[PDB]
Each structure stands twice: as C-alpha cells, then as structure tokens.
Design a protein around this ligand. Structure first.
Ligand SMILES: Nc1ncnc2c1ncn2[C@@H]1O[C@H](COP(=O)(O)OP(=O)(O)OP(O)(O)=S)[C@@H](O)[C@H]1O
Ligand SMILES: Nc1ncnc2c1ncn2[C@@H]1O[C@H](COP(=O)(O)OP(=O)(O)OP(O)(O)=S)[C@@H](O)[C@H]1O
Ligand SMILES: Nc1ncnc2c1ncn2[C@@H]1O[C@H](COP(=O)(O)OP(=O)(O)OP(O)(O)=S)[C@@H](O)[C@H]1O
Ligand SMILES: *N[C@@H](CCCNC(N)=[NH2+])C(=O)O
Ligand SMILES: *N[C@@H](CCCNC(N)=[NH2+])C(=O)O
Ligand SMILES: *N[C@@H](CCCNC(N)=[NH2+])C(=O)O
Ligand SMILES: *N[C@@H](CCCNC(N)=[NH2+])C(=O)O
Ligand SMILES: [Mg+2]
Ligand SMILES: [Mg+2]
Ligand SMILES: [Mg+2]
Ligand SMILES: [Mg+2]
Lengths: 724, 4, 114, 114, 114, 4
C-alpha cells in the first residue's frame, strides 16, 4: 500500500464526460498484487462487518448485493477499495455513484477513479479507503473508533466546503438554466458566465448592488428620513442617547404605547416591543442600551398589526411572508406543557443553517415572556386559541412564516417597489407592520419598519403554511434577463502537432472583427494585443484567467493532452472544438500507452462540443475522423486532399467542409465553393511550400466560418498573419 | 449581517 | 443675498442687533463683532461640502445639471426623476458593494489580481 | 480623493470632475425630466389634473402635485395641500417619475420661491 | 393553412357529429384532430387535455414540448409530467394555477373571472 | 476611510 499520485479532475476528462468531479489515484499493490479476496483469510467477514452498507452496491451483476457476491467469488482489491471509498464518502451524506479501476502498463500500479462531491472530502475518502483495506487484510477488522473518526472528519470536510442556503439556491437555478458558475477565491464570491457577460454574487448581493443603497439601508434613521421625505408611512419616533431624554422623546411620539430599540442592533438584539408605563420604559432603555454597541437607542410609536417580510427583486415584489412568533394552539384540549415538546417532535424541526423551522427554544427569557403572557405552563388555552411564546417573530427561534404573496394589495405592491427603488437596492427585504396586507397601508395604519440589504429568502422558498416562491429564479432573471446564459464563444484547439499555430491564427482572424480575443497558447496567455501571462499556460489554470477576464469576448484555448490528463477540461462545453491530428510520438507518459488511448484522450475536446456547436475534424486522419460519431452538434471536416471520399459524402448531404483544391483554401457549404485565398498570398504557408501550415490555415478558416465570421475578415486575417 |  | 442658509439667517439677525447697539450707545463692542464673525465662519464651515463633492457639484452646475442635497448621508442627487444619479463624495449610486469590499480587503484583492 | 490630480503642483491639472460627470451623464444629456408648472388664480388644479391625464395617455409615469394631494402615476403619494416646493421635491426626487406636473400657487412662491 | 404552428391546442374529442366525410369512428376523429398537435414545431408547444384519454394519447408522435391542462388537480398523468419537467395547468383550490414543475403560480380565484 |  503506497499512494504514488493523487490527481483531481474538475471538468470533462479522459475517464468520463458529464462526470466532471473525479479523483484518480495511482495505488501500488507491492505484496498483494495478484491475490483475490477469497485468498485473504477472513477478509470478507471483516469487510462486511465494518461496512454493512456495501450490501447496497449494485455491481456489474446489477442485483442487490452483487458486489458482495463478487467479493465472495474473489477479485482484485482495487475494485473493493474503489467501492469502500465510494461508500465511505456516501455515508457522510455525499451521494456518489461512479467508480473505475484499471491495470496500468507498469508491473504493480493500479489506477482507481472515484466520483466525489467535495474535492477535499473525495481525496480524504480515497486516502482512508486504502488504510481501511490494509487494516482489514492485516488484522481482519477495522476499529469502530477509527471508522467514526473518519466519518466525522468527512462530515466536517463536507460542512466546511459548503455554501450557504441562498447560494445553493441561486447556483442550482443557474445550473438548471445552463449558466456556467465558478467559485472565486477572495470572499466566497460566485461568478456566473464568462468574459464580458459575467456577473458576481456573494450571497444575495450582486455585482450591481450599490454601496450607497446598502449603506443607507443599514442606517435606520437615514432610511426613515429618506422614506418620510418620499411620503412613505414610516413609524413616528426619535433617537435618545441619554437617560434624561426619555420623557422628552416619549411626548414627541404622541403618547403610549411606544417601542424602545437599539440602532446598532439586528435580529432583535435587545428590542422591547410594547411598553405602557415608565418602569417598563426605563427597564427597556437599560436593556436596549446594554444590547447597544454605541449606547444609543431609538424610541418610536408602537403600531399594532402583524409583521410581514416583503422580498423585492429587480423592483418587483416576488414574495410576501407574514412572520408569526412561536405559538401553540390548544384545540386538542392540551396545555402548553405537552405542546412545547409535541411540536419539538415534528420532523420539520431542525437546527443549524439548513432547516429553516427551528425547534421551540425555551429559555429563561422565554419563561419571562410567557410569564408576562398572563398564563402558565399548565394553563390550558381557551377555546383552542393561539397563545404565543414571544414577540420577536423570527424563524431563528421557532416562529413560522405564512405566504401572503397572492393577497397583497396592488397599491402596496407599487409602494414597496417604490421604496426599494428609493433606497437603491436591487434585492431588498422590507419589514412591514400592518393589520391587513390585502388593504392599502393608508387605510390601516401600516408602516415600513426597516429595509434590509442582502436578505435571506429561506423563509420564502419553504413557507410551511403556503406556496413556495421561486426566489432564485427571480434572481437569475434579474442577472440574466432574457433566455441568455453568460457564455462567450469558446474555441478549444487540440491535436498533436499544430495547436499553437492554429490558436494564434484563430485569434488573429477573430481580431479582424472588432472583438477582444483572449487566447492561451504555449508561448503565453494573451488578452487582445497585450500579454496577460508568461509561461506554458495551456492547462485549465490559464483557461480560468481568460474566462474570468471582464473584457474578453471570445476565448481561444490551446488544450494539450497534459492538462486534460492532469485535471480535465477548464470548461463544461465549447462552441467550437478543433482536433487537428493524432500521432503517436510522445507515448507512454501517464497511462497513455496506445494510440487508441491517445485518440480517446484527444476526443474529450470533440465530445465536449455543445449541441449547437461544431467539431472541426481532420478527415484525412482516420483516428480523428473516427470521432465523427459520439459528438453532439455538427461536424465540419477539413482535408488537404480535395478528393477525400468522407469529406465529399459529408458535403453532398449538408456541407461545411474546407479543402485545398487548386492552390486555393476553399470552404464547401454543400454544393457551393467559396475560395478564400490563393495559399501563396498567405505568408505562413511560405508560398505554399509548407503543407502543415496550409492544413492549420484550413482548420482555422473552417472554425471561424462555422461561427458566421464574414469571408472578407477571414481573408484579411489570413493575409496579414505573419509566422512568429 | 448576511442573510438578513 | 446669502451663500449659506444658517449663515444668512444669522447675519440678518445680527445686523439689527448691531444697528440697535450703535444707535443706543454710539458703537459696537469689538469682542461681540469678533464673536459674530467667528460664529459666521463656523456656520460656513459646518454647512460645507468636501473638495471632491465641491468639484463634482461645480462641474454639474457648469453643465446645467440640477443638483440637490439629500438629508440622509451627505448624498447629492443629480437630475430629476428616472434620470437621476447619486454621489456621496466619490462613490456613485452605480458603485458596487462587492467591489468596494474587495478593494478594502488587501489579501483578497492581492489574491484576485494574482 | 482626486485632490492631488486637480492641483498637481508639478504638472498639468486634470479635469477629474469632468470625467466623473461624463461617467454619470454620458452624452450631452442633463438629468432633467419634462417639468410643467401651472400657475394662475382660478384654474390650477383642474388644468394640472387634465395635463396629468393627457400625458398618462402616453405610456409615461406622471408625477403631479395639486391642491388635493401629490400623486405618482395612478396612486396617491401624499395627502394635504402640497402646492409648494416641499412637495415638488417629492415628485422630482422619485426614481419612477418621467414627467412632472406641478401646481404652483402664489403662496409657495412667496414663502420659499420655486 | 400553415406548415407549422407555435402552439397547438387540443381541447377535447367527443364522438358527436360522426358520419360526415370518411370520419365514422371516434378514433378517426381523434386522428383528424391530432393534425394540429402533430403540426407543432419542435420549438413549439402542444397544449393537451390530460383529462381526455384520446387527447392525452396524442402525447406521443408530437414534435416539441407537451403541456397538459386538467380540471382535476389529481390527474396522475399531469402530476407525473410536472414532476419530470413541468408546464401544466390545473384548477386546484378555486384557483387557476400554472405548474412549472415544483412551483405553483396562481392567476385568479376563478370567481373573479367573469 | 473616506476620500482614500
Ligand atoms: N415602531 C414599531 N411599531 C411596531 N412594531 C415594531 C416597531 N419597531 C419594530 N417593531 C417590530 O419589531 C420587530 C423587530 O424590529 P427591528 O427594528 O427590525 O429590530 P432588529 O434589530 O432590526 O431585528 P431584525 O433584524 O429587524 S428581525 C419588527 O419586525 C416589528 O415586528
Ligand atoms: N498540422 C501539422 N501537422 C504536422 N506537424 C505540424 C503541423 N503544424 C505544425 N507542425 C510542426 O510542429 C511544430 C510545432 O508546432 P506548434 O504548433 O508550434 O507547437 P504545438 O502544436 O503547440 O506543440 P506543443 O505540444 O504545444 S509544444 C511546427 O514547427 C511544425 O514543424
Ligand atoms: N379659468 C378659470 N377662470 C375662472 N374660474 C375658474 C377657472 N377654472 C376654474 N375656475 C373655477 O375656480 C374654482 C377653483 O379653482 P380650482 O381649479 O378648482 O383650484 P385652484 O385654481 O388651484 O384654486 P386654489 O389656488 O388651489 S385655492 C373651480 O372649481 C372653478 O369653479
Ligand atoms: N442583512 C445584512 C446586510 C448588511 C450588508 N452586508 C454586507 N455584506 N456588507 C445586515 O448586516 O443587516
Ligand atoms: N446568510 C448567508 C451565510 C452563509 C454564507 N456565508 C459564508 N461565510 N459562507 C447564506 O448564504 O445563507
Ligand atoms: N477609502 C475608504 C473606502 C471605504 C468605503 N467607503 C464608505 N463610505 N463605505 C476606506 O475606508 O478605505
Ligand atoms: N473625503 C470626503 C469628505 C467629505 C464628506 N464627508 C462629510 N462628513 N461631509 C470628501 O468629500 O472629500
Ligand atoms: Mg435588520
Ligand atoms: Mg427585521
Ligand atoms: Mg505549443
Ligand atoms: Mg387648487
């Protein structure tokens, strides 16, 4: 047991396509190379007692317990290590269902490929599987304490590398719409789309959310002043820094009752709702000042009515939720003492940051509130009527949300949209206190309490007493208005011998159109006319630089075999995928020992072409031409021999080929021939003396033609491109 | 702050 | 005519007191005159924008673009209705929260730029 | 702060405020919306409401202030007299108003001007 | 009168006026009315009554997406269609609702529809 | 902070 190499693949790869996240391990089996499980005494029993859940694994037999039957028959341990890694990272709550094992050319090393949901979790599971299997083959069993330690480490790794619920909702919507998404490395920011079409979100703030609006929302008094200047019904009140100002502030609001609350507070930190006398007023001021970080508090008039949260996205009301505080109803002739834990036994109850409906937490503050309620633990509710536990009405404590989106008055919708626009927030959460959201806020004495930037919408996607609202869908609609993804044209060039020249020629041709081209070659990564980065810059680590640049409109990526083998492709799909040739020259590196394996590896580019894209293949190369099948999207052939039977048959039914017919670089669009240049006026061809350069020019011209680039631009770019 |  | 509202009101109130003191006693104390001038200078300083806001507002006035002072956060609003913009000192209403927060983070900015 | 660019002290000053205002208002465009001020002795409210209705026939959001109250589009934004500049600011600062129609009584002009 | 339609709606097929032309069986009538459903372009939609077995049988041999409408909200075929995909319409609780998969969008109370 |  020695781990030679541990690679992680993040995109389409040699092992699979549509299985982007994989881990590949080179495992040495020095002393246990060619002995089966049946040859190992007690291995099956120890394995099946350490991990009984392996009984679920449907192997190639395809029946329940098929993997266990295979273990009974006796096979190599690579398969069982794959299976135990899969089950080990699946027991931690990460469902994975892909695995492979292969014997390498070298005498002892195997290759094990395991699907993962989390990169660190997948690597840790791969590392733990070999230790578990070695311990079973050495001692016949694995300690349960070590199994629990590994499982809890996997769970901790999963939790650590996890987004917050708003971010999964938005990312899942983007995935459903086919919008590419990547994780930036600065502040848990997510980038959607590519190049000039990209957007950024953190949790709910987008890259278009204004600093001024966010900072105004966080200022309670400033928000109240601005809304009052706009005619919005805000509560009447004033600030009071010291104790001596309490009276003078109380007579300002217009009598009793009043509300006392800190201005540097959130989530109800030390806020008192209802007070009707001076003793309550002074206790309230003291408590709020203790909760205040700057010893400053606000008094205001108390407004009766239910508390509603209104979500406004892109100036439109998306969801309205009424927040009912923790309460119990004794319609079953039962008192609070039973219902407090009767509700706690509901499977809907859940702590943490995933389950929104938090269990009813009975604290000493809650005991004080229920003492103020006027009833006791064993006081049966009258007539089976709602009796409350607190007044903050927050889901973080055990309250509930009721969907009211379909009941809001149109005038209220207009007013709340206007409020969101006045504050200056693209996504806003407005807190309203009103007796009836179905009536305008002027008839009833409804008020706008506060406006929150970056609101959480987990209460709107699971109201628990109404219809869920597609908030993430509205956010994605705001970010990408039409049926538009954030993609830019991507041209991925692969092949054994002409990648760099073709990539540079493609970039030069596209530069003729007024577009900024970001292209990576072996020489370095360029954006437009300037060098963005030096070095090799051929793997996905340089593709991310191009795809994340806010000025790049078209990406041209040289995709060598090394990057695909090491970490797969840097993108899920490409608009154009060019395969120039496949020749067995540098053979034996990695697990690539046959030219068929090299063709399979280079076919990843061709197979990753989107259904609306094009695969530009060399019809003259049999291995490259064989990639015509298993390709989604159209196929365009290029050939230095104009009499290629496959190319001619392809052009007869359809078209889109490129040939070198009579000293001419020509595009065949079916029955039509469009000549670009005489191939002696193209400098790189060296007056037509370099057939390789002519083939590269053919591929580049066909690739740009498939994307609608006009013939004159292709001609100018081909004539002005100098070999360098 | 965050998820207000 | 005034340049600052509070300063103009204070000058109007002080002028009648100065004239009444002159008619009653024949002169005005120099200490009271200096106190009034210091109060006027303090009023001018208090109700003053910053040089960045001053320059931007002067350019907007030179271009004939209306400008008003919002009462919340020293914000200046240019234009009217749907065609309005807002600035504080150099931040505009189109300046992003994410960009500002990333710029304030030294290590995050270095990582992103690298 | 561009305070060092508008007065380098060892080179040419740069018009930073001009660049900021170009960013805020790209073309030769001010931030103005069409303003229609109705004044007179006896027909201000009726004319203001009729103008608001006529412009509403065009697909435009009309913010108009009359004696009855201040309206934006079809909805009442504020009650009261609302015929002075203190109510004109509400219309002119609203982010959704495209055309402003203001009833300008002599009382507001006398009190605080236009 | 057209080669293709963006939306093809089939409401119901009832064997009432049989015998006209060569149409003598309700299967022939369903085949005749299925011309509209089969003329929907691949990017188009076929709106079918899931509650009608003959109309629901037109789900196959249709190019383009299929959207079901049912007066019974518990139609098993409609629910199965919404679970994998969406785009259905039901009358659930005094409500004309659109099902977009797992999302319910209510339009009107069906008593406010004249 | 402010006018950096
Ligand atoms: N003037 C008021 N009149 C009536 N109810 C009020 C008033 N002020 C606050 N409330 C209620 O008290 C709740 C909390 O008030 P907030 O000022 O929002 O306190 P907080 O510190 O902001 O806590 P969060 O983050 O808003 S839940 C509101 O959601 C209302 O239900
Ligand atoms: N289509 C072609 N077929 C065969 N040989 C070619 C072809 N195009 C170029 N060559 C030869 O291969 C050499 C290197 O090609 P380049 O395109 O510059 O490098 P490359 O294809 O990027 O290879 P790497 O893996 O990136 S170093 C050229 O100098 C030619 O001699
Ligand atoms: N052009 C006019 N000439 C004379 N009287 C008019 C005219 N237009 C309207 N009136 C009458 O004047 C009355 C009051 O004028 P209104 O247009 O209703 O309001 P108003 O002109 O704004 O008065 P104020 O300034 O608000 S008190 C109307 O009810 C009409 O009877
Ligand atoms: N809800 C949250 C938003 C404050 C601004 N957020 C960031 N990231 N600057 C809050 O703190 O109230
Ligand atoms: N409210 C926010 C918090 C989770 C994301 N925060 C961090 N630090 N990852 C959310 O997205 O729910
Ligand atoms: N330069 C200044 C910018 C901080 C963001 N400004 C405001 N008003 N939030 C800084 O503090 O570095
Ligand atoms: N840096 C900034 C300071 C003026 C704005 N601040 C206040 N309190 N008015 C500036 O405008 O230069
Ligand atoms: Mg808050
Ligand atoms: Mg709140
Ligand atoms: Mg190269
Ligand atoms: Mg009037």
């Amino acid at each position: 047991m020695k781990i030679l190499k541990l690679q992680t693949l993040r995109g389409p790869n040699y092992w699979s396509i549509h299985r982007h996240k994989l881990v590949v391990m080179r495992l040495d089996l020095e002393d246990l190379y060619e002995k089966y499980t049946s040859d190992i005494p007690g291995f099956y029993k120890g394995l099946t007692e350490v991990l009984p859940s392996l009984v679920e694994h449907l192997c190639s037999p395809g029946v329940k317990g098929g993997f266990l039957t295979r273990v009974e028959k006796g096979t190599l341990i690579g398969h069982v290590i794959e299976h135990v890694a899969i089950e080990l990272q699946e027991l931690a709550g990460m469902p994975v269902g892909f695995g492979r094992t292969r014997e390498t050319s070298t005498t002892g090393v195997f290759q094990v490929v395991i699907e993962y949901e989390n990169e660190q979790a997948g690597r840790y599971a791969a590392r733990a599987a070999v230790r578990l299997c070695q311990s079973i083959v050495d001692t016949g069993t694995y300690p349960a304490t070590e199994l629990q330690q590994d499982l809890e480490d996997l769970k901790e790794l999963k939790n650590q590398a996890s987004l917050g619920p708003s971010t999964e909702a938005i990312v899942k919507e983007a995935e459903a719409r086919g919008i590419p998404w990547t994780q930036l490395g600065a502040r848990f920011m997510i980038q959607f789309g590519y190049g000039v079409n990209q957007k950024k979100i953190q949790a709910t703030l987008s890259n278009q959310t204004g600093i001024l609006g966010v900072e105004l929302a966080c200022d309670k008094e400033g928000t109240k002043r601005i809304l009052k200047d706009a005619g919005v019904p805000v509560p009447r009140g004033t600030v009071a820094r010291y104790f001596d100002e309490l009276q003078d502030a109380i007579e300002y609001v217009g009598g009793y009752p009043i509300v006392i609350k800190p201005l540097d507070g959130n989530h109800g930190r030390g806020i008192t709702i209802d007070v009707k006398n001076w003793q309550e007023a002074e206790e309230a001021y003291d408590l709020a000042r203790k909760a205040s970080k700057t010893k400053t508090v606000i008094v205001e008039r108390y407004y009766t009515g239910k508390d509603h949260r209104v979500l406004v996205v892109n100036g439109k009301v998306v969801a309205v939720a009424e927040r009912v505080p923790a309460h119990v109803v004794g319609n079953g002739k039962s008192t609070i003492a039973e219902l407090i834990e009767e509700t706690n036994r509901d499977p809907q109850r859940g702590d943490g940051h995933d389950n929104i409906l938090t269990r009813i937490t009975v604290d000493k503050s809650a005991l004080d509130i229920l003492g103020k309620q006027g009833y006791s633990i064993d006081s049966i509710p009258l007539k089976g009527k709602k009796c409350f536990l607190r007044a903050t009405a927050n889901l973080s404590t055990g309250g509930i949300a009721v969907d009211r989106t379909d009941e809001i008055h149109p005038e209220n919708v207009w007013l709340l949209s206007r409020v969101a626009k006045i504050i200056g927030l693209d996504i806003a959460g407005i807190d309203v206190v009103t007796e009836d959201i179905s009536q305008p806020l002027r008839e009833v004495e409804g008020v706008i309490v506060e406006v929150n930037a970056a609101p959480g919408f987990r209460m709107h996607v699971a109201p628990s007493r109404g219809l869920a609202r597609n908030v993430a869908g509205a956010v994605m609609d705001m970010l990408f208005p039409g049926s538009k993804n954030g993609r830019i044209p991507i041209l991925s060039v692969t092949g054994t011998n002409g990648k760099t020249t073709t990539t540079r020629l493609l970039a030069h041709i596209i530069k003729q159109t007024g577009k900024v081209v970001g292209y990576t070659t072996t020489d370095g990564t360029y954006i437009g006319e300037y060098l963005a980065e030096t070095g090799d810059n051929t793997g996905p680590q340089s593709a991310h630089l191009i795809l994340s640049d806010p000025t790049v409109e078209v990406a041209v990526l040289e995709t060598a075999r090394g990057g695909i083998l090491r970490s797969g492709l840097g993108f899920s799909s490409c608009e154009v995928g060019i395969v120039l040739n496949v020749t067995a020259d540098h053979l034996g590196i990695g697990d690539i020992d046959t030219i068929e394996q090299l063709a399979k590896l280079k076919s990843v580019v061709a197979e990753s072409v989107m259904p609306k894209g094009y695969a530009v293949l060399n019809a003259e190369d049999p291995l490259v031409a064989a990639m015509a099948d298993r390709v989604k999207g159209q196929v365009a052939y290029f050939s230095m021999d104009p009499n290629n039977e496959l190319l001619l048959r392809h052009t007869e039914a359809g078209g889109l080929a490129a040939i070198y017919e009579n000293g001419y670089i020509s595009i065949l669009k079916g029955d039509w021939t469009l000549r670009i240049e005489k191939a002696v006026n193209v400098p790189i061809t060296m007056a037509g003396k370099a057939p390789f350069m002519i083939a590269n020019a053919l591929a580049a011209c066909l690739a740009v033609f498939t994307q609608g680039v006009k013939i004159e631009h292709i001609r100018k770019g081909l004539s002005t491109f100098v070999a360098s | 702050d965050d998820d207000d």
